[PDB]
Amino acid sequence: SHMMMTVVDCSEYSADLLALASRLPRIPRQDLYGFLDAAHEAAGDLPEGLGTALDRFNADGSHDGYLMLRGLPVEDDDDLPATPTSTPAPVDRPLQNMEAMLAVIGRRLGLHTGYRELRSGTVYHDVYPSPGAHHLSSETSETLLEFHTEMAYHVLQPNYVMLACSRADHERKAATLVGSIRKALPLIPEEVRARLFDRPMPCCVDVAFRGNPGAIANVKPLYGDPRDPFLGYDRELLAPREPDDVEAVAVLSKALDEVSEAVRLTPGDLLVVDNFRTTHARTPFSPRWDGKDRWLHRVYIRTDRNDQLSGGERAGDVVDFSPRR
Numbered sequence: 001s002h003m004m005m006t007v008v009d010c011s012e013y014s015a016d017l018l019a020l021a022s023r024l025p026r027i028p029r030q031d032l033y034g035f036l037d038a039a040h041e042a043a044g045d046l047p048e049g050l051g052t053a054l055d056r057f058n059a060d061g062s063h064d065g066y067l068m069l070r071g072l073p074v075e076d077d078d079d080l081p082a083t084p085t086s087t088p089a090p091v092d093r094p095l096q097n098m099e100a101m102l103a104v105i106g107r108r109l110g111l112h113t114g115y116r117e118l119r120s121g122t123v124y125h126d127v128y129p130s131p132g133a134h135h136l137s138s139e140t141s142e143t144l145l146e147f148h149t150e151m152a153y154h155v156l157q158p159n160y161v162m163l164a165c166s167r168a169d170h171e172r173k174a175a176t177l178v179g180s181i182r183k184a185l186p187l188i189p190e191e192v193r194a195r196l197f198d199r200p201m202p203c204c205v206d207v208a209f210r211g212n213p214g215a216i217a218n219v220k221p222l223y224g225d226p227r228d229p230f231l232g233y234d235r236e237l238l239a240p241r242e243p244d245d246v247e248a249v250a251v252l253s254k255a256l257d258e259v260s261e262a263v264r265l266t267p268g269d270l271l272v273v274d275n276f277r278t279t280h281a282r283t284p285f286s287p288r289w290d291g292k293d294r295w296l297h298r299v300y301i302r303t304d305r306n307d308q309l310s311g312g313e314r315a316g317d318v319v320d321f322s323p324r325r
């Protein structure tokens with residue numbers, strides 16, 4: 001299982017966190033840059049224990065590849081609106097407590113980033129089920145959302161994916177799976193590691209970025225430091241052609257399966273995924289279309305490393321698509 005340090009019980013911080021949220025702009029999408037500036041001020045006033053846990057994780061990730069915050073001050077279910085059924089969100093939608101947490105905790109880590117072609121270029125995404133969801137969509141439910149490093153094929157791939165839960169699914173069945181390369185690497189033979197490392201392989205892109213044009217990107221499954229590598233994996237989109245490459249990726253795929261951990265998000269939970277050292281998935285659940293379907297809020301965070309940033313960026317920036325080559 002995950003380490004002790006990987007789960008942070010924030011229940012004791014509830015009143016302090018609500019106080020920070022009370023000073024944020026109530027209609028964030030009317031002025032997202034100013035909203036996130038206010039959240040950056042609040043980030044410096046986080047309770048010391050929570051600030052320290054975030055800073056430690058930010059420095060170089062962890063063996064588990066994620067940080068789970070629990071007990072954040074989510075609204076009671078009947079004080080939330082109905083779960084969204086459309087994207088993008090209305091510009092005048094009032095701020096919800098778990099969105100405020102994504103703002104403050106997100107700015108403690110880095111810069112919120114939107115992607116112009118994805119969900120209308122918005123920064124805050126609602127993750128909810130839809131009845132006709134494409135099999136690669138985070139709006140899936142009954143079909144498994146397969147392992148993916150988020151936007152691994154994108155030059156401006158973010159360091160973190162952050163998921164904040166306002167509603168779990170009714171049966172609390174849906175598991176967010178995290179596969180950490182730090183756990184998977186010991187299971188991969190040195191010979192296979194050597195084939196994977198720094199080797200660009202053809203990779204398709206998600207629907208939002210297709211302008212099916214095929215494998216228009218090149219992704220290195222392992223890269224960076226060979227003794228502590230970064231991971232770029234997508235079970236559906238990575239398309240190795242050479243039989244050795246196909247074989248090496250299959251070994252990596254089975255290793256990530258073997259070490260994957262299941263996180264079942266409940267209201268008030270916030271999951272920070274190290275998107276340079278993990279791949280993540282979501283297991284099946286059955287929506288009910290009753291107004292209370294599963295509802296996460298998702299943002300992407302860039303940090304100043306791995307050429308994510310080149311100068312002048314602000315939290316709230318929306319960037320254009322460029323495939324890794």
Ligand SMILES: NCCC[C@@H](C(=O)O)N1CCC1=O
Pocket residue numbers: 118136137138139148150151206207208209
């Ligand atoms: N197969 C997982 C991709 C899910 C998809 C979505 O938002 O539905 N996505 C995150 C970036 C992007 O496109």
